[PDB]
Every structure is written in C-alpha cells, then in structure tokens.
Design a protein around this ligand. Structure first.
Ligand SMILES: Nc1nc2c(ncn2[C@@H]2O[C@H](COP(=O)(O)OP(=O)(O)NP(=O)(O)O)[C@@H](O)[C@H]2O)c(=O)[nH]1
Ligand SMILES: O=Cc1c(O)ccc2ccccc12
Ligand SMILES: [Mg+2]
Lengths: 164, 310
C-alpha cells in the first residue's frame, strides 16, 4: 500500500477543509474556522490499488508553502465559484509549485468549489476549463463539499496522476 | 504570521494544528476550544500526552506544553527507562472516565468516528481480548467501512492476504488464528454488504463497530506498565488496564488476558512507598501484587472509576 502525499491549496474560505473533511469523514463543515494546518489520513482504492492518502489541508493565507510543495506529490488547487479573487489567486500558486518542483509535470487539479451555490456563481465553468486548458491541459472539476459532487474524484484523480 | 501552535494528533496519525494563545501556559481546556468540536463532541474526549512507553490523560487545568518540557522528569518518576529515550506528542482521545452509558447515547458523527478510530487502533494493536467470533465480526465491519460493499469479483479469493488482514484483525492473531478466519470474515462481509437492513451510513457502520467493542472487557482502558511475580519466581511484565468496567491485566509480550475484574468483585491497596499495589479478589479467595512506579496513578483512577458507579 503506497503512500500518497496530497496537498489542498487555495485562498481563504474556498472550502479546502470542507472538501477534505467531506472526503475523509463524510461530514459537511458549516462553521468557518480558518485552518492553521491539518493533516488527514484515508485508505482508498484507486484503479484496483489500496492507497494510503495523507492529505494536508492548508491555510488560506499562510513560509510553509515552499515546504508543502517540496514534500507534496499532488496538489488540489481550489477556488470558490462564488469569489473572483479566489480564482485569480490560483495563478501564483500554480507558478510557485512549478518553481519549487522545477518541472512542468506536477500532479495537479483545478477545483471550482461551491457549485451548489449556482445562483451566486461569479466564475463561469468555461473560465474554469479555460484556465485548466492553458495550464497544460490540467485536470479540472467543479465540486460541492455540501452536495458531495465530485468530492472523491478530486483525490482519485490526483492519485492517478501520481501513478503516471 | 507569529503566534504559537501545536499539533494535536489522533490515533490514525492525523492531526489538527491549534493556536497556543498563551504559549506554554495554554491549558488543555483552551486547546480543546481550538478544535473544530462543539460542546457535544468535546465532552467525550480530552488531551493526552504520549510517548512510546507512557500515556497520561491530562486534565482541563493541565498545561500540556509544560508536560512536554518536563517529560524526562515524568518518565523518571513514573517509569524505569532512560528519560532522553523519547519525545511525547499530544493526542485527542476518549476521556477514560466517560461512562459507557453516556457513550451509548452518542449520535454525533464526528464523535463516533473519533471513538471508532481509537477503538480500531486498540483492536489492531491487540489490546482488545475477545472470542474469535466477536473479532471476526469486527474484521467484517472494518471490511465494510474501509473497502465498501463486498464484490464477488474483487473479494472472493486470495484478497485476504496478510496485507489486507493486518488492517482488520489484531496483530497478536495475524499469523495464529487469523488466516483460518478468512472464509468466515468474507462470509460476514458479504452478509453485511447484501443486507438491505444494515445501514451503510459511515457513522452507522462505525457505531455498530463500537457496539461490538463496548462488550469487550478492556474497552476504553487507560493502560499502565508494571510487573508481577509468579512461582520458582519469574517476572511477568504486564499491562494494567483500568477502565469504567474494572481492572484487567495483560501479559505485556503477548497481550493475553491474565485477569479481568469487575468493580465490586475486588479490592486494592496502594503501597507505602507508592511503587506497587495489591489486588484482593473479594469473594474469589485470590490475591496479587503489581510492581510499577505508576501504582499511584492506577489506584487514583481505580477509585474514580469505581466511585463513579452509584
Ligand atoms: N454551500 C457550500 N458551502 C461551502 C462549500 N465548501 C465550503 N463551504 C463553506 O464555506 C466556508 C469556508 O469553508 P472552509 O472549508 O472552512 O474553507 P477553507 O478553504 O478551509 N478556509 P481556510 O483557508 O481559512 O482554512 C464554510 O462556512 C463552509 O461551510 C460548498 O461546497 N458548498
Ligand atoms: O491518576 C490520574 C489520572 C486520571 O485522573 C485520569 C486519567 C489518567 C490517565 C492516565 C494516567 C493517569 C490518569
Ligand atoms: Mg480550512
């Protein structure tokens, strides 16, 4: 059983914790408690393999990021479809990882959260796919921690990429 | 970004970072606040401090970082090891005082998974002594919880190697009675899977697991180390488990259950030098002494958990 070090990254309030806790514990975190740094462990099966996931749920604001990126094998970059700045912020995160890893080829997924808040959508699905396309055909998903849509796939996709 | 923080671990190896508002002066009580738990969740659990050779439950007023600092002195006072040996970490775990009656009330999914993770840890470590059938049930529930629904295709043959068994059966049994169990674990797995009457909600499956653990005599025990002497005079190293049900002695090496005593079926006396305690097995005409520098803690806890019944 291979260990996979996954890192969930993005600006404050996007649902990094909510996504992680839903995935790991099957619970929806309603209260907004800014994260310092939480780590979770979960055994899953991806393409017939028992995998031990270690998921680092990081702070929206943060010298640690460099280290997270050095150590992480796979990164979920999360924005809220509800908040434009959270989407904007993700360029530097993507560029920082590439810098720190010194390679184009880092397992990575773009995740637009708060999909259940369709009404309050500020960021279009197409803007989302457009950003991912441009990022060397990055994996892309819209997700909901509340509704459970595409929660598991975030982590499974990251594993697949690492196995590649 | 300056402020102080600490990792509070759980049994599964996960952790939550908690701001230390008062540096090393921060208390258990305040740290428990820094978690993502309600007044419901929090009542079941507290901060422990643990290294490999010692686990202590701390109390609301304790300053955990001070215990971390003073650990070599603590190890010196309570154990026989060289104190530079090990560094403790802080963990969130079940309060040893938590009445089983109360725990049976619990509905909160997070409290259930935290209790379940800890229970699972004790099972796999061998601290839960139970009939082979009860253990097979626990392995089957673990299979449902961790691997999801039974699949004829995936699960039928040679899937329960030692690899997979290790995650579902006590380590003490992994190569003794466990490989003989596979037919019967899978059977019960399949039975769970294809039972439409048994809920597959995570918290429901985990609560079921706990239900089967509540019956085990050592459930929820704080463990201490010490030694007993038998006939013609050998040292048997032991775990002393004190839980809300009674006192339990485990052979340290094998984890075998030596004695298990319900409260009000035995008496205890602490040593004058606070280094041993005697157990008088009232209405059983038997006795034994346990040597440990933890004797003081054992006796205090025995009193508490005994006094807790009414
Ligand atoms: N409707 C809805 N609300 C969500 C979703 N994900 C998160 N939220 C809400 O958004 C708020 C912030 O979520 P949280 O997971 O704490 O965000 P974060 O990215 O971890 N924040 P931080 O970086 O400070 O740690 C919470 O109130 C949470 O309930 C989602 O998919 N749908
Ligand atoms: O004796 C004091 C204790 C206590 O009051 C509660 C829990 C404990 C757990 C482990 C070791 C000692 C204690
Ligand atoms: Mg968070």
């Amino acid at each position: 059983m291979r260990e996979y070090k996954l890192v969930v990254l993005g600006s404050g309030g996007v649902g990094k914790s909510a996504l992680t806790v839903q995935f790991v514990q099957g619970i929806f975190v309603e209260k907004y408690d800014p994260t310092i740094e939480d780590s979770y462990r979960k055994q899953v099966e991806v393409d017939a393999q028992q995998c031990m996931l270690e998921i680092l749920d990081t702070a929206g604001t943060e010298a640690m990021r460099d280290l997270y990126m050095k150590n992480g094998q796979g990164f979920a970059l999360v924005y809220s479809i509800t908040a434009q700045s959270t989407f904007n912020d993700l360029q530097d995160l993507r560029e920082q990882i590439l810098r720190v890893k010194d390679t184009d080829d880092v397992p990575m997924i773009l995740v637009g959260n708060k999909c259940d808040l369709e009404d309050e959508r500020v960021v279009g699905k197409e803007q989302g796919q457009n950003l991912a396309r441009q990022w060397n055909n990055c994996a892309f998903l819209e997700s909901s921690a509340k509704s459970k849509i595409n929660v598991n796939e975030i982590f499974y996709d990251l594993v697949r990429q690492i196995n590649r | 970004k300056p402020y102080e923080k600490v990792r509070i671990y759980r049994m599964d190896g996960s952790y939550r970072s908690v701001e230390l508002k008062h540096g090393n002066n921060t208390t258990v009580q305040q740290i428990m606040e820094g978690m993502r738990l309600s007044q419901e969740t929090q009542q079941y659990f507290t901060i422990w401090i643990c290294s490999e050779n010692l686990s202590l439950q701390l109390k609301p007023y304790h300053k955990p970082l001070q215990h971390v600092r003073d650990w070599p002195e603590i190890l010196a006072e309570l154990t026989n090891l060289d104190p530079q040996r090990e560094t403790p970490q802080l963990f969130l775990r079940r309060d040893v005082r938590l009445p089983l009656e109360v725990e049976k009330q619990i509905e909160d999914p997070l409290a259930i998974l935290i209790l379940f993770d800890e229970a699972r840890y004790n099972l796999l470590k061998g601290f839960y002594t139970a009939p082979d059938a009860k253990l097979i049930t626990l392995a089957s529930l673990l299979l449902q919880i961790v691997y999801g629904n039974y699949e004829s295709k995936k699960h039928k043959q040679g899937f329960l190697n030692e690899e997979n068994l290790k995650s579902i059966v006590p380590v003490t049994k992994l190569k003794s009675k466990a490989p003989h169990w596979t037919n019967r674990i899978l059977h019960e797995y399949k039975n769970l899977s294809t039972s439409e009457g048994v809920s597959k909600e995570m918290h429901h499956l985990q609560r079921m697991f706990l239900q089967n653990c509540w019956e085990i005599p050592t459930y929820g025990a704080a463990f201490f180390t010490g030694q007993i002497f038998t006939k013609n005079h050998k040292v048997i190293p032991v775990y002393v488990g004190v839980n809300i049900k009674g006192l339990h002695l485990l052979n340290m090496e094998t984890k075998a259950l030596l004695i298990s005593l319900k409260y009000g079926c035995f008496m205890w006396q602490l040593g004058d030098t606070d280094t041993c305690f005697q157990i008088h097995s009232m209405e059983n005409k038997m006795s034994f002494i346990v040597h440990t520098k933890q004797a003081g803690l054992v006796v205090k806890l025995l009193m508490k958990l005994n006094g807790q019944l009414m």
